[PDB]
Amino acid sequence: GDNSNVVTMIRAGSYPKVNPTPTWVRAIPFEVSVQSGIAFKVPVGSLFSANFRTDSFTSVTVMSVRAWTQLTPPVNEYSFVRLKPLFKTGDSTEEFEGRASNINTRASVGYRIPTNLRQNTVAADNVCEVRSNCRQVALVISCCFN
Amino acid sequence: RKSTGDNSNVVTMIRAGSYPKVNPTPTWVRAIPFEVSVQSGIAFKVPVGSLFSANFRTDSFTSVTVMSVRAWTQLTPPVNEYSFVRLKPLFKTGDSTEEFEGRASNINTRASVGYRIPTNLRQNTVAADNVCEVRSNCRQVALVISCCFN
Amino acid sequence: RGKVKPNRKSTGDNSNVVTMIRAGSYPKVNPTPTWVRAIPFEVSVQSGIAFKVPVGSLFSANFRTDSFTSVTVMSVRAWTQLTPPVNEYSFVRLKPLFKTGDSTEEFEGRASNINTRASVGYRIPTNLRQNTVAADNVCEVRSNCRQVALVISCCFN
Amino acid sequence: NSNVVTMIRAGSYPKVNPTPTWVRAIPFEVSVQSGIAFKVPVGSLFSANFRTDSFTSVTVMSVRAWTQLTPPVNEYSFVRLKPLFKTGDSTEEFEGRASNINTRASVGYRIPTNLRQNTVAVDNVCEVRSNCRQVALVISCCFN
Amino acid sequence: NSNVVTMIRAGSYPKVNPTPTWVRAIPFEVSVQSGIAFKVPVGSLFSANFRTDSFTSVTVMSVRAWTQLTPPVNEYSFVRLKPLFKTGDSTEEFEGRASNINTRASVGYRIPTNLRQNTVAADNVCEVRSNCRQVALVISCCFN
Amino acid sequence: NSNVVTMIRAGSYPKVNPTPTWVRAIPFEVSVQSGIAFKVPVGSLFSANFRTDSFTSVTVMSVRAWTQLTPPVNEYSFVRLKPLFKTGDSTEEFEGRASNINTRASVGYRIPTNLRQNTVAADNVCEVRSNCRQVALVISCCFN
Amino acid sequence: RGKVKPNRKSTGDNSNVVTMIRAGSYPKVNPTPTWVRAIPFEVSVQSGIAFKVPVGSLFSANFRTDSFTSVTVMSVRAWTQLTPPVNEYSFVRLKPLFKTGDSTEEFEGRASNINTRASVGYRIPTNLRQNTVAADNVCEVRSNCRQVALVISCCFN
RNA sequence: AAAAAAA
RNA sequence: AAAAA
RNA sequence: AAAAAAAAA
RNA sequence: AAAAAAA
RNA sequence: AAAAAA
RNA sequence: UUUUUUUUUUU
RNA sequence: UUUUU
RNA sequence: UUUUUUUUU
RNA sequence: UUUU
RNA sequence: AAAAAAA
RNA sequence: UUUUUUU
RNA sequence: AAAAAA
RNA sequence: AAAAAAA
RNA sequence: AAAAAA
Numbered sequence A: 001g002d003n004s005n006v007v008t009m010i011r012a013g014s015y016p017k018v019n020p021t022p023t024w025v026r027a028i029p030f031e032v033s034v035q036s037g038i039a040f041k042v043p044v045g046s047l048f049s050a051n052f053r054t055d056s057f058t059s060v061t062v063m064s065v066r067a068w069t070q071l072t073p074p075v076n077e078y079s080f081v082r083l084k085p086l087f088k089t090g091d092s093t094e095e096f097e098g099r100a101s102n103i104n105t106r107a108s109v110g111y112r113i114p115t116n117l118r119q120n121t122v123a124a125d126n127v128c129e130v131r132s133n134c135r136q137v138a139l140v141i142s143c144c145f146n
Numbered sequence B: 001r002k003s004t005g006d007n008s009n010v011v012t013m014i015r016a017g018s019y020p021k022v023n024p025t026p027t028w029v030r031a032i033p034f035e036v037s038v039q040s041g042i043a044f045k046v047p048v049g050s051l052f053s054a055n056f057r058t059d060s061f062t063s064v065t066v067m068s069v070r071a072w073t074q075l076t077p078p079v080n081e082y083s084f085v086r087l088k089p090l091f092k093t094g095d096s097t098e099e100f101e102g103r104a105s106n107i108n109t110r111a112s113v114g115y116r117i118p119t120n121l122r123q124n125t126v127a128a129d130n131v132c133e134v135r136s137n138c139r140q141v142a143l144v145i146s147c148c149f150n
Numbered sequence C, G: 001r002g003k004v005k006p007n008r009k010s011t012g013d014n015s016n017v018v019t020m021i022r023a024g025s026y027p028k029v030n031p032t033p034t035w036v037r038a039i040p041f042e043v044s045v046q047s048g049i050a051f052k053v054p055v056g057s058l059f060s061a062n063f064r065t066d067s068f069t070s071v072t073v074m075s076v077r078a079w080t081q082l083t084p085p086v087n088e089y090s091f092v093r094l095k096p097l098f099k100t101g102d103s104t105e106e107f108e109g110r111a112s113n114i115n116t117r118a119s120v121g122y123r124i125p126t127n128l129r130q131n132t133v134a135a136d137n138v139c140e141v142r143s144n145c146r147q148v149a150l151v152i153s154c155c156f157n
Numbered sequence D: 001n002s003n004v005v006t007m008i009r010a011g012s013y014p015k016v017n018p019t020p021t022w023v024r025a026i027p028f029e030v031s032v033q034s035g036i037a038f039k040v041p042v043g044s045l046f047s048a049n050f051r052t053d054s055f056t057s058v059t060v061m062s063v064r065a066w067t068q069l070t071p072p073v074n075e076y077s078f079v080r081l082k083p084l085f086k087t088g089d090s091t092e093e094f095e096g097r098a099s100n101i102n103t104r105a106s107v108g109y110r111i112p113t114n115l116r117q118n119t120v121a122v123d124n125v126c127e128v129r130s131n132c133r134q135v136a137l138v139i140s141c142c143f144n
Numbered sequence E, F: 001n002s003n004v005v006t007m008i009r010a011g012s013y014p015k016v017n018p019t020p021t022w023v024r025a026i027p028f029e030v031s032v033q034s035g036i037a038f039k040v041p042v043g044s045l046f047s048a049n050f051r052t053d054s055f056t057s058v059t060v061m062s063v064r065a066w067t068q069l070t071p072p073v074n075e076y077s078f079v080r081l082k083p084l085f086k087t088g089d090s091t092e093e094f095e096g097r098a099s100n101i102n103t104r105a106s107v108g109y110r111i112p113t114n115l116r117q118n119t120v121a122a123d124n125v126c127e128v129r130s131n132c133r134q135v136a137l138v139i140s141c142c143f144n
Numbered sequence H, K, Q, T: 001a002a003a004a005a006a007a
Numbered sequence I: 001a002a003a004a005a
Numbered sequence J: 001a002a003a004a005a006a007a008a009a
Numbered sequence L, S, U: 001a002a003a004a005a006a
Numbered sequence M: 001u002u003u004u005u006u007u008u009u010u011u
Numbered sequence N: 001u002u003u004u005u
Numbered sequence O: 001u002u003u004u005u006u007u008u009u
Numbered sequence P: 001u002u003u004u
Numbered sequence R: 001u002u003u004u005u006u007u
């Protein structure tokens, strides 16, 4: 073990259980385009792509969403970003907002989904609404692909 | 061995007794964020009515017990200057003459400052009242007020 | 024992004169040994295309590593060397490359301040630490900045 | 101990392998000239004189050298070893000199775990330099 | 341990140095005439055969010397070393003799910390005296 | 404590020294051209602006350097230091770069005790290289 | 006590400047002191005859012991400096000599290898450690080799 | 368990 | 001391 | 994981 | 124990 | 466990 | 790395 | 856990 | 400690 | 938490 | 080293 | 570390 | 117990 | 505890 | 509690 320098025999037993398409817990980074004064609905379909090795999945259980302002804010302003979680059983009305204390620095915020509200979502569904004075917002979402 | 049980999967029955004491419109401790417009060299009185709003779920209240006030500069300062902000607490029994000032050591960084109201001065304030005066070289200031709505 | 040949080594660890070394048989020597190094050099990237970092950049007279023809890379760290495009924050991606098979990871770091560099690195496992000659590549660098700084921890042999 | 045969209560047919591996130290000689390096081939390890004519690959761990013949007149024996690798040859020259003219010169080097891959007969182990006409080599390897 | 690449959460750019120092033990030989001292030049340390040709100065810490060739007939090998300094040469003759005619003669001297300054190629390390025509040197020094 | 003068029962006359040594941390700036090294003169330490114009020699212990002006457009500030010695200049380029374009770049090097000798005004401390036109220096040294 | 004259002796054992020494009365001095030494020199012997080693060989500019006229010998060690005759192994004999009375011992060492030196020594007791001038002899050396190396441990005064 | 905050 | 995986 | 093989350098 | 994952 | 050394 | 209130099983 | 004195 | 044979949880 |  | 276990 | 049956 | 020295 | 004061 | 510094 860890000191061997050649191949060694494994005394395997019966054929085991198998699963060629298991689950995967991931953190998916991507960006969205946002306009001023309007809220953008983040689609779940942005997670199922070949760029994330997840084009083979058709459902996902989201756990937490984190957002950063990807582009600079308007002139004389500080960056901010808001998040309103969305659920098929009932959308929420929260506005988890974080503002940058430096014009040159991003504005970050996030929210964690409780265990009772951690069901599956499909590409047609939406995660949350994003609001910002910046034009582009980078998102990092922790979730469990299944 | 047999004593593992706090994860329920089905509905359980609640053996309730007499009718309890209820209150459909209780109090609420909050941290209300909002912004105000500020002019150069001119002090702006922050109205308490800014706290009662549907944008804060507080439009149903008519009075509030303010505990502490914090302020951040919301826009950039003038050219060559660092951001600053001042606060002067106001009270219906007698306004204060303190100017708690917090400046910015970085021109690109907000200027922050705040004050805490003592227990002896934590009374209700209606919308017509004012919380404090705000002075800043920036044209807009952001506030976060820890208050108890009732 | 015996008596003295006066080499005045005062208090052992504090002599001010040359002292005789009682040498013995000729030892094992190596005029060209190995050298574990952290080599700082810059590579240039275009906005939207990848750039393969040649291993030959490590061997140079600017690094004293000019007598080597092979090197074992341990870990690669990257920093954006130039400012990002307007309105944008800095970012840098690293995709490890190996002769036995290129990888597909994109270890990315993004600067939260437009004036600050974006940094990210990756460590090569022990089972993949073989030699790489000048004709080989280390990794693929992507960035919105025109130049990326690299500090490669490696062993020259 | 015993004096007669005993019964073994065997069970299922175990995992077998008619051609296993073998960790060895292979002693063989090479011819070296003055001022020129000799690339020791890995094919020298595979031979019927070492019970390794059935192996096609091997994993070298450490290499040791000894001057097999007397040095030139007025000189002391020395021997150099430059490790060679398919992913990239080295430039080290691990050298050992003899302090007595009538005594061998000994030197050796160890291959790290990260460089211990298989080498076929076409490959080379190391370059051997010596002022002596022959060098004795004892190579600790793992035949597979 | 790990079998794949792992991310390194790097931070700010660190302090770098592409041309660092190097502590070495340089082996080289010199020719020695009978009854004559040879001033070992410092420039012998700077060479592409030692990977040190990129340096221009070096801090010598200790010097060791062996006889590289056989002594004259009926004699035992000997070797002497006289430390040389730009601020003032010494007059010590650290001598070492062999107890077997077939064996080398070895001797050395350590430089005190107060006398460990830089030396350039034009400078000399020490004077060497021997009945043998060549002397093997191993100098522990600090390239900078 | 005491509120008035108190007598000092002095004895014999003591050993005096009107011109003693002084350990300092001298701050001064130098101009640096792009792509060119600047030999920092030792004489910059001897000045009435540092109270050290009464000295003629100084023992440098450590050297630290910051970028005093802003870098060129789109670049991050950097600074290099090459230690210089009369007994032999070095080839190290202790470089430090900034991670923020608006922030200085800092780097330094410590001189070993064996290389801590006196230097006069004509001598040079180190070579400095930077993309900025000025470099702020703080040199820990011993005036004597 | 009082206040300071600033001699910056950093951490006591690590000052980088000259520091004042508070000297007092003039001490006891000796411009020509003693010197305990181990003097290496060679003497030549013939096969079958003895050779008296003069004490004057110790005083020389080659040993820095040129200003001395007397010396106290403590111990004598000998080594054959040249090869032995053919078929023979090396041997060396030492017979101590003293002014108060020569001795008759023959402390002999023989080399078990024809290529190796033959070594032997003798220590002089404290009751016999007086001074010997250049006109005196140390010991008688016998050997089959033509030259014998001597390392004499002594005190020069 | 859920609402200021704190290095 | 009882149940239902 | 019995022997053969580098060594805690 | 290795890799992916939250402060 | 690199390269130097009471 | 340390709290005020809406309900809230259990020691 | 779930259902029972 | 490692490579192959045998023991024992 | 997913694997044999 | 021989019978019925070896936990 | 269980033990009990003829050389 | 030689010759130098917080 | 500060200053003046005896060995 | 001055001025320098793993």
Ligand SMILES: [Cl-]
Pocket (backbone or CB within 6 Å): none
């Ligand atoms: Cl011949």
Ligand SMILES: [Cl-]
Pocket (backbone or CB within 6 Å): I004, I005
């Ligand atoms: Cl069940």
Ligand SMILES: [Mg+2]
Pocket (backbone or CB within 6 Å): C080, C081, C082, C083, C084, C090, C091, C111, C116, C117, C118, C145
């Ligand atoms: Mg950048």
Ligand SMILES: [Mg+2]
Pocket (backbone or CB within 6 Å): G080, G081, G082, G083, G084, G090, G091, G111, G116, G117, G118, G145
């Ligand atoms: Mg002899």
